[model samples]
Target: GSVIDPSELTFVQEIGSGQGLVHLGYWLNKDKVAIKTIREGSEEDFIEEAEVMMKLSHPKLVQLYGVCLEQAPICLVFEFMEHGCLSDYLRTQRGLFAAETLLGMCLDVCEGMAYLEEACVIHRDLAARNCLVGENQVIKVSDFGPVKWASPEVFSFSRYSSKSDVWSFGVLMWEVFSEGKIPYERSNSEVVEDISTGRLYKPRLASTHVYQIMNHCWKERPEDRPAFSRLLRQLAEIAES
Candidate 1:
């Protein structure tokens, strides 16, 4: 039940925040099963978000286990990802990841995005920090705070659609190639504004294929973007070549 003692759960380590002020708590049970807690007031919003995620069952998507909604402080439980987030992994002193490894992770991200697109779920805040990397270099999308369910009425204020998610994913790809430096680190707001005004730049990387994909994603016009499935095919072809 939600009233269970916090002391009863074995603490592992802090996995950082996903959105808002909520920090992720890694815990474990005697049976060695990993559990994650996402905090309270955000429960309703998160649950609304999770309704979409729970329906999404893909190898590339993080798995949601259960929820503790009976108490004052509600929390959603999830399967713990061992490698942590892609942002942390890239920021580590472990040096830059191999191109193939990075590409593989990106591919997984695209796969997950493809699934969400097919389900008409728009992940409005697709970024490197929201992606969790698992063992074997698998990638899973996380943090659905900015997600918007596709609805014609909501489209005006939402600014979210399959194409918009792809645009953010493109920015995520730029962050990945830059080794975790978010695109336009210092003046991100200005950069986004410029992007909105039809000025966008690609990250400095040797991978032309990667840059090309990003360029396609950062297009000023939302309709002028490739779907995740198409993007995945392009990425896979580049990886294979």
Candidate 2:
């Protein structure tokens, strides 16, 4: 096999990772187009995620340009996000964002999730780290490693589904309102024990509405979770008030 020269493409700095196996980097072409790549194995899971990206088209979602499957190692190319992940930005500038700006970002995330839900795509691993921001401060959901298409079953304990994605989204909302802190800083077991044993932490009073929304999201029963459409409507109403 011959190696093609993407010399026309300029390599920028490397970005961090979510899954240990995959690596992401920024690239720019002579035509001033920015691109990002996810390089990893040629496994079916990775390929499926890439394929999903090709079919998904929305402003709130990252755009997939091309995929290099023939290469020894597979790579997925996407439009580069200038500001990178939202978690990174929030970590540095805590308490600086205006209420409207943060609310707007939350709305954008809900819109993206709503689109995915409509497509029967569940982002099983939705989190702050997976959401990215553009130069103009627009929010776009990224990292579809845990996404799954629709299935007949309404809910499954082991399999990924839209309801489970809502659970993850609830955790994401908690992180955002907490200024980027993960839902449970300690152990998953401890968190589970606490929640199951009637020892849940008291929701913060300052962000009562936000905390209530998260509480609804993290309910133990999947069916009890609100759909993205309903969640978005509730959040919009809160924002308007």
Candidate 3:
């Protein structure tokens, strides 16, 4: 809610480390917070996106405290989720956090994505690794990645949209059930084509219905994919079963 003075924030430990941006755990105003710092001269698009995300607030979405863009390394403050990245935690937590037990986490993501859809914001990067887990098994969506393009589509073939986000969400669901194994693990552009049209490969299924939902997102036409709201409903039914 406020743009904090960098003076009040003291780095405690590194939470997220990447070549593009680094996230650090900081003690600010007597409370622990996560700070994402992008060195100045890095793209300004990140700050713009941070500011845009700051306007968004929801329980299932990571909360943005504010940002410090005037300093050497522009920084943004976010709510701390203690359990860490959803991907890392899920890898070793399969038996501990049963798929049914983690069903709410899936729903948490859907709810957050639904909000972004309603607001017409494209997450661009939606995956288990981008999620943060809090207490009570609450998982909050975070890290929309960079403004720069790196997703397969470059010149004009593909575009970012709610449906593209939905596609990513399907892969995320696969990661959740498979204990963090990436979807299309070894597939490349050519492999994706064969799988899409020729069934050269199939999405590994944890359950019959689970794969149905995944295929729904992988539909050839973007308009045919399920919206997050409907996806949540479908998952809820699957959860109870």
Candidate 4:
């Protein structure tokens, strides 16, 4: 890649914030661009995370262009999703979509996770707020800070795998289906510990099938969970039914 000179793009506004209060700037160009600044004292870890993201390219994932490393308030540039956070999008447009539409969005994320799983790249952190809604209302999975989205396995033994990602994806699904409700909203690490180690269910729905999928993702043993592709297939069936 080439250096992303500030001259090449213009900062339209600050869209959001990231790790250590780093800013998510909406940079302008022929295409929509998202610029994530690297705040002071946040380098090595951010670089490692940035490098992993750089290797990723998928329709259902946010695409990283490059970086402006030497510039003031250095930042990583990415393809912008015009609609912004998927949870927020749904919040503003609630009741405008049907079960099929929401399910399709979940499938979109599953497709992306499938790609990452194929690459053996664990997301480690995935949530509804960590995803974006782009053109055509497609969900593009994004990464938030490791601390905020870290899995239970990460603490006990630094064990992170696609199965753990499946766990996060399940949590993300819960948020979406529950209309962005946070699981154990008040609890922190123990909530994940309780969840990854056991079953704590919620939701009262007309169709139990979707709820079943959510529960399936909560299985403590990673082997019991379905891969993203299998999950995608089931969602398709649910969408049709």
Model 2, span 74-114: residue lDDT tens: 45566767777787876676777766677677788899999
Count of clashes in candidate 1: 0
Worst 10 residues of 4 by lDDT: 20-29
Show the colliding residue pairs in model 3: none
From the highest lDDT down, the ranking of the candidates is 4, 3, 1, 2
List lDDT for all candidates, in order: 0.66, 0.65, 0.72, 0.72
The residue pairs in collision within model 2 are none
Clashes of each: 0, 0, 0, 0
Give the TM-score (vs. native) of candidate 4. 0.86
Q: On residues 1-241, what C-alpha lDDT tens digit does candidate 4 reach at each position?
A: 4457787777777767655332345444476678777766566566566677777788888877777767666777777788888778877886576667777878989999999988888776687877999878889888722333445566567888888888787777766766655567545665555655545355432158987897777666778988887888888888777
- lDDT agreement of model 4 with the native: 0.72
Weakest lDDT window of 10 consecutive positions for candidate 2: 146-155
Q: Report the error of model 2 at residue 170, Å.
A: 1.1
lDDT for model 1, on a 0 to 1 scale? 0.66
